[PDB]
């Protein structure tokens, strides 16, 4: 990917040709992208207790009430803001939670990322090469009334769910919907962004899972993801291709 790509993606968000995306927006998005990596470097060494105390989550009671009901919960969020910081907040305010991560190449790099996230207090299951299938483990967490977190706006594989996203076709992962259907767990959209020199985080009302249609649910997730991103366009650092048309 790159920043030329990032321009093509922001173009969808604001409904303008790539050339007309406001310069101020591109700068802030690039600044935001840099900030994530800058924070990732030092995050493991910060005072996690302090961060948990000083950062807030809007409408966190949504999550708490699902957990009071014994239902478990799926936190689905886009690549906006600093999701790693949100994870630290949850470890401190709730406890360890489970997630999954793509097994990058090289293997030395995958382990590095695992060590990183493990040092933040997450359980990260490999999508491949683990003892068991990841989405069985996730389901057990949900059935024990625990939260899992999933990055949920990108999955450009055969198995990704085809959805409309800012008026154009993309594919998103099916996991959040599958798990909610399977476990009865609440499916909460989440958004993270940068609010000045700090971090914004919000939980939104759980999604309607009545249809039992993985497609309708995932599309409803996208509709929300799209709305929030339209609200915080600069905080969504997507440098890789997102929409199908931008692919090989
Ligand atoms: C109520 C707000 C709390 C939300 C907590 C979200 C924590 C997410 C942790 C993500 C860990 C790994 C995902 C990154 C992998 C990737 O998509 O490149």
Author numbering: 48 to 295
What does the study report here?
Here, X-ray crystallography, site-directed mutagenesis and enzymatic activity data are used to define the three-dimensional structure, acceptor/donor substrate binding, membrane binding and catalytic mechanism of PatA from M. smegmatis. PatA catalyses an essential step in the biosynthesis of PIMs in M. tuberculosis. The enzyme transfers a palmitoyl moiety from palmitoyl–CoA to the 6-position of the Manp ring linked to 2-position of myo-inositol in PIM1 or PIM2. Our results reveal that the enzyme has an α/β architecture and shares with other important eukaryotic/prokaryotic acyltransferases an acid/base catalytic mechanism involving conserved histidine and aspartic/glutamic acid residues.
Two other crystal forms were obtained in P 21 (PatA–C16-2) and P 42212 (PatA–C16-3) space groups, and the corresponding crystal structures solved at 2.90 and 2.43 Å resolution, respectively, by using molecular replacement methods. The high quality of the electron density maps allowed the trace of residues 41 to 302 (PatA–C16-1), 48 to 295 (PatA–C16-2) and 48 to 303 (PatA–C16-3). We have decided to use the PatA–C16-1 crystal form for our description since it displays the highest resolution. A close inspection of the three crystal structures revealed that the protein crystallized as a monomer, displaying a high degree of structural flexibility in the N- and C-terminal regions (coloured in green in Supplementary Fig. 3; root-mean-square deviation (r.m.s.d.) value of 1.6 and 8.4 Å for Cα atoms in 41–47 and 288–302 residue ranges for the N and C terminus, respectively). Strikingly, one molecule of palmitic acid was unambiguously identified in the difference electron density maps of PatA–C16-1, PatA–C16-2 and PatA–C16-3 crystal structures. We believe that acyl molecule is associated to the enzyme due to the hydrolysis of palmitoyl–CoA during the isolation and purification of PatA from M. smegmatis mc2155. The acyl chain is deeply buried into the hydrophobic pocket, and oriented with the carboxylate group facing the groove and the acyl tail extending into the globular core of the monomer. Interestingly, the comparison of the three crystal structures revealed conformational flexibility in the carboxylate moiety of the palmitate, located in close proximity with the lateral chain of H126. In all crystal structures of palmitoyl–PatA and PatA–S-C16CoA complexes, the carboxylate OE2 oxygen atom of E200 was found at 2.8 Å of the ND1 nitrogen atom of the aromatic imidazole ring of the invariant H126. It is worth noting that when the individual palmitate molecules observed in the three crystal structures of palmitoyl–PatA were superimposed, they showed important structural flexibility at the carboxylate region, suggesting that the carboxylate group is not in a catalytically competent position in the crystal structures.
